[PDB]
Design a protein around this ligand. Structure first.
Ligand SMILES: Cc1cc2nc3c(=O)[nH]c(=O)nc-3n(C[C@H](O)[C@H](O)[C@H](O)COP(=O)(O)O)c2cc1C
Ligand code: SF4
Ligand code: SF4
Ligand code: SF4
Ligand code: SF4
Ligand code: SF4
Ligand code: FES
Ligand code: FES
Lengths: 121, 456, 209, 78, 114, 216, 80, 112
């Protein structure tokens, strides 16, 4: 056993369980993305007058505006900040850990020159 | 403002050593039942508002203020209850260290009966039950003779003191259980069941003994009540600090030179308490290993702390401890603390009523661990473990016996960790090394019992 | 006639003066417990349904804490999870290793709540070990194996209240409390085979099955 | 599964034939033997199953001593 | 290999009918009926393995807390009928009889690793 | 320790009869009247004590008879007298040694007192003497903690003890003649310091009548 | 599915195996709502019976009920 | 340490990517869900063929390889089967899922 887990007295199990700390599927409708385009975000909220802000949320929550109307009403800075990248380019399909290849050519290769298989590392 | 050493005119009780006899005429010479007729004729609101001005804290160990405790008893529609209200006097003590309430009842059974009538008038109680310890046979006999003298004088009964107020003091004797010291277990033992504590949100001032409202007061804080109504609240409020007011009987026991019971001021230094009125310490102030203020249910104060500590509720709560019953059990340096707290844990294992699961399943585990730590059959980590198994009992129980059984273990681990490590290193180099639970590598379960290990 | 409070952010309305565990059951909040039952009296023995209540210093027992207005209840406090692990470990240290021979294998309330709320491992490893309770012959219909009793009083509360057979009870202090007739007296009632579905552990169980 | 910590190369053919599918199999033997050597040398100590007994079973030393672990053992299999 | 129901020292059947080998068996080969016997002890009336739908996963051996059923390393028991390949309680008690000297050697080297 | 489960061999039977003595019956009717006439059952605690004064111990005949007297089932008597330490349900001798062993007696030598008792006899702290005279019982705090090592015999406590005086106490009780009624070998009064009296050194008390509030 | 009289189970002559001729005895479905189960069951063309659930009646409990004052006969002894 | 903690930055990148993909084809993408570095686009059956071509043809996506496609029935839903498509862009080292629905008799169009 390892030390912070076989420990007789300092850990409780709820601090070190991770089966019960599983995260949920972030399910996003089309209308909650209209909410994120028009209300804003928790990082950058574009909402003033919070007591009226709940009512401003509620018509989108009932289906007041549409998504194409949300994209058309949205400013160029919003479209280039949160939908697009900051240069105006589409976001690249993300990968977790990128791999950069390096072909091994010389006498460290697995087959010498003249064989149609190369080692790629 | 040097707190301590009050004059002989400023003591509440004068029978505390039996110079003057417990007789009713001797109580008249002492000053009892002198103006009780007029005090009963005064309103209950005046008595409650006078005892609120004194700062009478609770003398049973909880410390809760008695004026606020007596005022919770009358919500403004109590008259719509239309029945009997009962008062209960907790004359059962069994707290290790204290003798103060046996000293109430043997010396002065009459200020008890007087304070019973006065506190029943303060809360409009119809009767009163005094719960004597069933061990205390001669104490119960002397109290019954004194209550009979009070019936014969007419100062108690159907027409108490010519004031049209009815009041009966009966005596109940509890055959040897210490969890019956708790107020609600006391109520259930008077009801005729087994004496187990009940849960909190049915408060006993709301609905209590016999399904009727009842509060439970200590026998001392009732025996102080008539003199503090006579002398006034302003005289009692002068002693002690601003919130901790007045005087208290202290039972100084353990290994002092001269064990005694005095009645002295609150907020007084422990050194001036032990040095000036009980000889000293057997061996001097060098010979102080630890001190337990209050009963068994208090953590130990170590040697450097207990030099400048005062004996109120504040200066002991500030050092993470309790005043309790203000029994002073000092522990000799030639005695062992681990054997002492093993005996305290065996006391709480014997005395638990056994109703809720963390208290009952806990003090058996605390005893199985303290026997093992007294022998020394452990690893260095298992006393950090014992700290955690104090913490898991400490606040999840019905009454405060689980809270009480937690605390001395916690004080031992906070103040005497190297004293336990020394015994454990001693066991590690007398005989072989030891695994968890006390198991040794030779230890195997043969037919029936376990051999290979010396079975603590 | 009703009281509105908050459990887990959920807002719930319940009839006045009820227990807090009925408010948790109404709001859908799952609270573990061993000595509470719908058809029986309230006792606070098992200490399992402790719960974080604003304006309370200690975790209060949710089965006997009455419902008050303006109440904010939280059940996912770290203190409540610690409390459930603590009380569960306390229950398990004198309860014997009888799960392959117990009759409540896939049915044990103590067992399914020990995965969900209790501790992973056990620190009970003394040489002196667990206590042992004498077996108590009650009758021909009820097999009785009282080492695996947790003293939830539920059989006693029932045979007192509803069955009307006052022969059951609890005699002792400390660990030496037992649940049985004191004299070894046979239990009759017209429904004595109902105490064996009632005990959450398998201490009172079926004799022909 | 700790293939990042272990160093190897990869053979990838150039013509899509059955012969370059052959030559890259012949070299993944080599790379696999390289894995086996680098993992024989760098094997650490410690536990071999996951930490907790709510998803896989306790050892038989422990579940015959532990009430908690007997409960977990009897539940992970029924 | 084939299956065996062991016995205690001084001869007692070891199978306390806990049904754990039945509940885990991925191909449903185990079938057990259990009754309380004359002593009041819990024992199996009927124990049975179908060896034509056993898959040799060893979960039945991993699951038993008493360690009552084990796998002997015998693979040389090939038969000529199906009826012979259905092992009741008696065939498996005779196997756990026969292989006990060998299962000592197996569980002296396995039991720490279990 | 507490041991509950009752054995039905001899001298503890529902069949063996029991009734109150008429003085005990008059005291029983006096004690039941202390409580409201509804809650008769609340007098279960003293009446068993009353039966314990008549018999040597609390049998099942006394618990069954008090249950018949009080309109109670007998299990409600069995719970109450099993929960309490003082209802000794086994027969003992005449004298019941109750040596306190809690820490304030332990710090002042109750080890020496218990050793000086069980050297004189040969019995264990749960064992009785074969003469049926003495019965050891180690006990927790008996309320006299200041009188630092002590014990109890029947209802009288004996305090401030030495291991040399304890064997003389036992030899006095082995001859029938009671040793003292007093609490010690005459070294103090009750709880006054052993040197003398530090406070309350007056001949007549101060009356409370001169120091009054003026509020009345 | 409700069982068939002849086809459910019968003890084997050989060993005592529970042999069946009914093949839907082990199948059992779970649905979210009652309406989804009815829609699927009459969509597949099946004759169904539906059984209504039974919840417990809400009755208000107090712990302080356990010891209320009895003016007349006690007619009960609680014990806890 | 929680093994879900190592994903969190890439899971945020996956969120921003999917919000872009929804803003690019608003006619055809009903929703999406990001679990833990797993992206799932939620699309109508008459919208299968226009989304898939996009996932093949846009240079930012380039989900060339089909990996595995299958169905799952939920009998409680009116549209009983859901049909899942898994793709892998071997350029960008990325995976993607596409979920549609179909009843027992009504179709979903083929991407073959
Ligand atoms: C296990 C336990 C034992 C107790 N024993 C006593 C006792 O022996 N004497 C006493 O006066 N209070 C004792 N108390 C405190 C009682 O609850 C006390 O009567 C009440 O809390 C306060 O009474 P007071 O206002 O007079 O201080 C005990 C409490 C507990 C939890
Ligand atoms: S704390 Fe212990 S003695 Fe007190 S009520 Fe609870 S179980 Fe009983
Ligand atoms: S009742 Fe107790 S012993 Fe029996 S199976 Fe459940 S947890 Fe195990
Ligand atoms: S006998 Fe059963 S129901 Fe009764 S308290 Fe014990 S475990 Fe609970
Ligand atoms: S062989 Fe093992 S798992 Fe199978 S019934 Fe017997 S004890 Fe249980
Ligand atoms: S080896 Fe596997 S399939 Fe065979 S009886 Fe054991 S668990 Fe079942
Ligand atoms: S169920 Fe609430 S504490 Fe036992
Ligand atoms: S401590 Fe021994 S009698 Fe109180």
């Amino acid at each position: 056993s390892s030390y912070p887990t076989n420990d007789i007295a300092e850990n409780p199990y709820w601090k070190r369980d991770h089966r019960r700390a599983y995260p949920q599927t972030a399910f996003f409708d089309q209308k909650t993305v209209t909410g994120l385009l028009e209300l804003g975000s928790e990082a950058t909220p574009r909402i003033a007058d919070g007591e009226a802000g709940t009512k401003a949320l509620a018509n989108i929550a009932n289906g007041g505006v549409s998504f194409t109307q949300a994209l058309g009403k949205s400013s160029k800075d919003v479209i280039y900040g949160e939908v697009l990248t900051v240069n105006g380019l589409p976001p690249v399909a993300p990968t977790l850990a990128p791999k950069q290849w390096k072909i091994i050519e010389g006498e460290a290769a697995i087959y010498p020159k003249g064989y149609p298989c190369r080692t790629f590392h | 403002r040097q707190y301590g050493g009050l004059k002989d005119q400023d003591r509440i009780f004068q029978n505390l050593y039996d110079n003057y006899g417990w007789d009713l005429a001797s109580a008249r010479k002492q000053g009892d039942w002198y103006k009780t007729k007029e005090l009963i004729l005064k309103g209950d609101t005046w008595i409650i508002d006078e005892i609120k001005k004194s700062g009478l804290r609770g003398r049973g160990g909880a410390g809760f203020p008695s004026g606020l405790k007596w005022s919770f008893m009358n919500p403004p529609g109590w008259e719509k209850n239309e029945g009997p209200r009962y008062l209960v006097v907790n004359a059962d003590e069994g707290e290790p260290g204290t003798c103060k309430d046996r000293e109430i009842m043997r010396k002065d059974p009459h200020k008890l009966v007087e304070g019973c009538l006065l506190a029943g008038r303060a809360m409009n109680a119809t009767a009163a039950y005094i719960y004597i310890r069933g061990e205390f046979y001669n104490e119960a006999a002397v109290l019954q003779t004194a209550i009979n003298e009070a019936y014969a004088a007419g100062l108690i009964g159907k027409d108490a003191c010519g004031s049209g107020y009815d009041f009966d003091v009966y005596i109940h004797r509890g055959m040897g259980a210490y969890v019956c010291g708790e107020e609600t277990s006391l109520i259930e033992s008077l009801e005729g069941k087994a004496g187990k504590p009940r849960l909190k949100p049915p408060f006993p001032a709301g609905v209590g003994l016999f399904g009727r409202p009842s509060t439970v007061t200590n026998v001392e804080t009732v025996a102080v009540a008539p003199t503090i109504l006579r002398r006034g609240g302003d005289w009692f409020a002068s002693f002690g600090r601003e919130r901790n007011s007045g005087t208290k009987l202290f039972c100084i026991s353990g290994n002092v030179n001269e064990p005694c019971t005095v009645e002295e001021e609150m907020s007084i230094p422990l050194r001036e308490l032990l040095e000036k009125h009980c000889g000293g310490i057997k061996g001097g102030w060098d010979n102080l290993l630890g001190v337990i203020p209050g009963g068994c249910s208090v953590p130990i104060l170590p040697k450097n702390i207990c030099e400048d500590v005062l004996m109120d509720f504040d200066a002991l709560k500030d050092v993470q401890s309790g005043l309790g019953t203000a029994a002073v059990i000092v522990i000799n340096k030639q005695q062992d603390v681990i054997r002492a707290i093993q005996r305290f844990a065996a006391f709480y294992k014997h005395e638990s009523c056994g109703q809720c699961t963390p208290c009952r399943e806990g003090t058996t585990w605390l005893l199985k661990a303290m026997d093992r730590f007294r022998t020394g059959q452990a690893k260095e980590r298992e006393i950090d473990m014992l700290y955690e198994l104090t913490k898991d009992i400490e606040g999840h129980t019905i009454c405060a016996l689980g809270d009480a059984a937690a605390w001395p273990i916690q004080g031992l681990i906070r103040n005497f960790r190297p004293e336990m490590e020394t015994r454990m290193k001693k066991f590690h180099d007398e005989v072989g090394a030891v695994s968890v639970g006390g198991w040794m590598k030779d230890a195997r379960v043969e037919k029936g019992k376990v051999v290979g290990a010396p079975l603590p | 006639a009703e009281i509105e409070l908050t459990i887990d952010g959920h807002k719930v309305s319940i009839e006045a003066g009820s227990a807090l565990i009925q408010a948790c059951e109404k709001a859908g909040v799952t609270v573990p417990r061993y000595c509470y039952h719908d058809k029986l009296a309230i006792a606070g023995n098992c200490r399992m349904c402790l719960v974080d209540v604003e304006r309370a210093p200690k975790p209060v027992a949710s089965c006997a804490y009455p419902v008050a207005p303006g109440m904010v209840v939280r059940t996912d406090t770290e203190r409540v999870k610690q409390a459930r692990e603590n009380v569960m470990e306390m229950m398990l240290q004198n309860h014997p290793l009888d799960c392959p021979v117990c009759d409540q294998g896939g049915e044990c309330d103590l067992q399914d709540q020990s995965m969900r709320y209790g501790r992973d491992r056990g620190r009970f490893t003394e040489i002196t070990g667990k206590r042992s309770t004498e077996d108590k012959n009650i009758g021909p219909l009820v097999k009785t194996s009282m080492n695996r009793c947790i003293h939830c009083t539920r059989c006693v509360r029932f045979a007192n209240d509803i069955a009307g057979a006052p022969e059951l009870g609890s005699s002792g202090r400390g660990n030496d409390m037992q649940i049985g007739t004191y004299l070894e007296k046979n239990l009759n009632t017209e429904l004595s085979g109902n105490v064996i579905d009632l005990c959450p552990v398998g201490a009172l169980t079926n004799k022909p099955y | 599964d700790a293939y990042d910590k272990v160093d190897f190369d990869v053979p990838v053919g150039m013509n899509g034939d059955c012969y370059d599918r052959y030559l890259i199999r012949m070299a993944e033997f080599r790379q696999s033997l390289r894995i086996i050597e680098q993992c024989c040398n760098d094997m650490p100590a410690g536990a071999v199953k996951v930490e907790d007994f709510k998803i896989n079973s306790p050892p038989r030393n422990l579940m015959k001593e532990d009430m908690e672990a007997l409960i977990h053992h009897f539940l992970l299999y029924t | 290999g084939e299956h065996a129901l062991r016995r205690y020292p001084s001869g007692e059947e070891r199978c306390i009918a806990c049904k754990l080998c039945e509940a885990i068996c991925p191909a449903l080969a185990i079938t057990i009926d259990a009754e309380e016997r004359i002593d009041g002890s819990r024992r199996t009336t009927k124990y049975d393995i179908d060896m034509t739908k056993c898959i040799y996963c060893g979960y039945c051996q991993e699951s038993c807390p008493v360690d009552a059923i084990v796998e002997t390393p015998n693979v040389e028991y090939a038969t000529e009928t199906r009826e012979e390949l259905l092992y009741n309680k008696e065939k498996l008690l005779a196997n756990g009889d026969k292989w006990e000297l060998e299962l000592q050697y197996a569980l002296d080297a396995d039991a720490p690793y279990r | 320790h507490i041991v509950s489960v009752h054995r039905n061999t001899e001298n503890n039977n529902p069949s063996i009869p029991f009734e109150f003595s008429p003085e005990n019956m008059k005291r029983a009717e006096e004690v039941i009247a202390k409580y409201p006439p509804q809650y008769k059952k609340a007098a279960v605690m003293p009446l068993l004590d009353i039966g314990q004064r008549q018999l040597g111990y609390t049998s099942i005949s006394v618990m069954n008879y008090v249950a018949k007297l009080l309109e109670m089932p007998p299990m409600r008597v069995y719970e109450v007298a099993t929960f309490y330490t003082m209802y000794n349900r086994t027969p003992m001798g005449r004298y019941h040694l109750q040596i306190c062993t809690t820490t304030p007696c332990q710090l002042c030598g109750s080890d020496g007192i218990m050793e000086a008792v069980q050297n004189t006899l040969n019995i264990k702290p749960g064992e009785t003497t074969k003469d049926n005279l003495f019965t050891l019982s180690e006990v927790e705090c008996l309320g006299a903690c200041v009188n630092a090592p002590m014990m109890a015999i029947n209802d009288d406590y004996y305090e401030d003890l030495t291991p040399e005086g304890t064997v003389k106490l036992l030899e006095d009780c082995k001859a029938g003649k009671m040793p003292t009624p007093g609490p010690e070998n005459h070294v103090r009064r009750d709880c006054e310091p052993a040197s003398g009296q530090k406070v309350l050194l007056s001949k007549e008390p101060h009356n409370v009548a001169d120091f009054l509030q003026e509020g009345i | 599915w409700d069982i068939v009289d002849v086809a459910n189970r019968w003890e084997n002559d050989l060993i005592g195996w529970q042999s069946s001729g009914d093949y839907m005895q082990a199948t059992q479905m779970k649905f979210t709502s009652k309406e989804s189960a009815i829609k699927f069951a009459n969509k597949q063309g099946w004759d169904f019976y539906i059984q209504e659930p039974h919840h417990r009646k809400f009755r208000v409990k107090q712990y302080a009920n356990n010891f209320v004052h009895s003016y007349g006969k006690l007619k009960h002894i609680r014990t806890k | 340490v929680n093994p879900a903690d190592r994903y969190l930055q890439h899971v945020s990148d996956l969120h921003q990517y999917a919000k872009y993909i929804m803003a690019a084809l608003p006619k055809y993408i009903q929703g999406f869900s990001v679990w833990k570095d797993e992206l799932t686009l939620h699309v109508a059956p008459s919208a299968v063929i226009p989304v898939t071509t996009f996932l093949r043809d846009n240079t930012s996506t380039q989900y060339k390889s089909i990996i595995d496609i299958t169905a799952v029935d939920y009998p409680s839903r009116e549209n009983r089967f859901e049909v899942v498509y898994n793709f892998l862009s071997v350029r960008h080292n990325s995976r993607i899922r596409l979920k549609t629905y179909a009843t027992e008799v009504t179709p979903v169009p083929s991407i073959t």
